[PDB]
Structures are given as C-alpha cells and as structure tokens.
Amino acid sequence: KEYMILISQLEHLQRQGLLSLQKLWFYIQPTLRTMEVLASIATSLNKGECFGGATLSLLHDRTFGYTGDSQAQELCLYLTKAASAPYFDILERWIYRGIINDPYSEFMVEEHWDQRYTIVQQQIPSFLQKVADK
C-alpha cells in the first residue's frame, strides 16, 4: 500500500508533466531497495519450502544478517514480529487449556496414558531447543 501510493502522487505532477528520467530515478533507488529485500526473502522462500517454526527460525536469522542498513533491519524485524505473534499465540493457547489445533501443523507439538508430546525436529522456535523443551 505504501509502494503504490507514491506512484499515484507523482502522477498529479504528470498532468503538469515535466518530471524526469532522473527525478524518477532517485525515487526508484530507495524503492528498488524495498523491493529487492522483499524479492530476496521471497526467493529464499521458494528454495526453502518451510512453514511453522522452521519459518520462524529462518526469519530470526534474517534479523542477524540484515544489520548495517537501518531500514532493511526495520522490515526484517517487523517480518519476524508479524510471524511470531501468530506463533506465540498458538503457544499461549496451548498453555491456558491445552488446545492443540493444527490447520497445517503450525505449532510443533502434536497430540499423542501415552505422554508422547515429542516436540518435533521439523520445527524449532525463534530460540534454541532449550525453550522448546521448556
């Protein structure tokens, strides 16, 4: 929504049309930046085929790597925070009653006398296995 709204605002200056190949070139180098990070997350997701906590640990690794550019850090933080607020809500909905619901097995723990909750090695939280055992 933020990408498509700048393009319409300079089109108000296109009815007074004098804008350049260069004034446009400056605004596209910030918005190639926004799109190239988004493409390179998407390209990693096509090669990956992860879901659940395996996606959560991949996005936690992108908070490490994309540091040095402030605004590439801010989206990679926000993408991790928007992937964890579903996941840790599925955590909390397992803590208050023990409601294990699996649309496509988002959470790791599957329902088994048995005592067989057996975390999974398929997925892991944003932290290491110590909090998964916890």
Partner: protein
C-alpha cells in the same frame, strides 16, 4: 486510513518540491 496514507506521501512530495525550489533560488539569485 487510505486517505491518511495519501497525505503522508503528499508531505514527502512537498519537501521534495521545497528542496528543488531552494536550489532554483540559488540558480536565480547568484546567476
């Protein structure tokens, strides 16, 4: 919502036209 985001990009275009008009005054008062 959608009108508020249209005003945020309009404020970014206003500082753009102000930065280009300030250098145009340096191209018209020292020229």
């Amino acid at each position: 919502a959608a009108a508020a985001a249209a005003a945020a990009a309009a404020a970014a275009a206003a500082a753009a036209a102000a930065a280009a008009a300030a250098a145009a005054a340096a191209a018209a008062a020292a020229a």
